[PDB]
Each structure stands twice: as C-alpha cells, then as structure tokens.
C-alpha cells in the first residue's frame, strides 16, 4: 500500500520532469522527498496526499500559478518538519538522514537555484553516507544543511 504508492509518486515525478518547468519539477521533487520522509515514519495518509498533489501538478501542468507552487513548497516544508517527530525509534543514522532531507526541503522552499543544487548534492552525499554508516560526515552534512536553511531565511 505504501510501497506501491511511492512508486506511482516516482512515476508521476518522472512524467513531470518530462513535461514541467523548473518550478514545477522543484515542487515535485520536494514532494517525492517529504513522501520518502513519511514512508520512513509510517504515515500513509501523508503519502496519499503526496500522490494526490503530484497528480494535481501533472493535471494542471499548464494552469498552475507560481503562487500556489510556493504555497505547496512552504506546506511541504512544514509537513516534513512535523513528520520528523515520529522518527524517534530508529537508528541515529536514519534520523540524521531524515533531518537532512527535511532541511533540504526547507531550502527548496525559499532558496535560490544554486542553493537548491548544493542542498541536493548534500542530500545525495547523505544517502551515500547512510549506506556506509559514516556518522562523522552526516553530522557535518546536517550542520552544513543548517548553515543554509537560515542562510536563505
């Protein structure tokens, strides 16, 4: 149910990157991220909402207004920071990875394009460090995330 929904979310995201514009794919990738966040914590209603919003973007691919893309970016931020609360029974590694992902979303909300690039590169790096179990680099990657979410605040 949750594993078949995130995959449809990914499919919709790919179609959006086929069709959408920089702001629309920005929104869609932020969606995929907070979706994975919710999957890590067991909140399925969130991921259902995420599939609904991504399909909404796909449908209104030529009628959506950047004002409401920004509303959804801010909302996705707020939601990710709220979902982080259910992540207190998992290893420290995945917790720091989840916080890194949420900070990346909050950067995608208000940050400029180059800052979003940097945040996505650091998110990828954290995804590698998780497979390597490297604490000493993901801690500093989260700290550098923080030296960014407010750097564009």
């Amino acid at each position: 149910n949750i594993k078949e929904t995130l995959q449809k979310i990914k499919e919709v995201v790919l179609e959006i990157m086929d069709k959408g514009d920089d702001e629309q794919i920005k929104l869609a990738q932020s969606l995929l991220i907070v979706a994975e966040i919710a999957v890590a914590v067991g909140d399925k209603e969130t991921v259902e909402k995420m599939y609904k919003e991504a399909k909404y973007i796909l449908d209104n691919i030529n009628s959506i207004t950047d004002e409401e893309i920004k509303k959804m970016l801010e909302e996705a931020a707020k939601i990710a920071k709220k979902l982080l609360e259910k992540a207190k029974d998992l290893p420290e590694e995945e917790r720091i990875l989840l916080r890194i992902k949420a900070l990346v979303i909050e950067v995608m909300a208000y940050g400029d394009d180059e800052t979003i690039k940097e945040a996505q590169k650091l998110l990828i790096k954290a995804e590698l460090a998780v497979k390597e179990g490297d604490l000493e680099t993901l801690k500093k990657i989260l700290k550098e995330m923080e030296k960014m979410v407010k750097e564009v605040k």
Partner: protein, 62 residues
C-alpha cells in the same frame, strides 16, 4: 549486487551536479529515479543500462 550499481550511478549523478548545466542535472536525476524504480522492482538489466547511460552523460560532460 544491485546496490553497487546504485552507488555507481548515484556517485555519477552527484558529480554531474557539480559542473553540468541544468539539462544535464535534470537528465541525471531522471536516470537516478529510473534506477531507483528498477532497483525497487528488481531488474538487473535495467539498472545496468541506466548505469551505462549515467557514465554516458558523464562522458558528455568531458
């Protein structure tokens, strides 16, 4: 097995993001998520060809 190819293509996308242009970065992320899809659905041929295409876009940004 599959996670090794995942690591290779993820490294490739991470380094494509450091100098390439927006189209190269978007295509790299496209290949990344297509990989993720195939790796979740278990299909070695797919992940392998996605790795080939990722190294190909890296060769595009010589």
């Amino acid at each position: 097995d599959l996670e090794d190819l995942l690591e290779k293509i993820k490294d490739i996308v991470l380094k494509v993001m450091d100098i390439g242009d927006d189209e190269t970065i978007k295509r790299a992320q496209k290949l990344l998520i297509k990989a993720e899809l195939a790796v979740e659905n278990k299909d070695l041929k797919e992940v392998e060809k996605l790795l080939k295409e990722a190294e190909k876009v890296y060769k595009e940004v010589k």
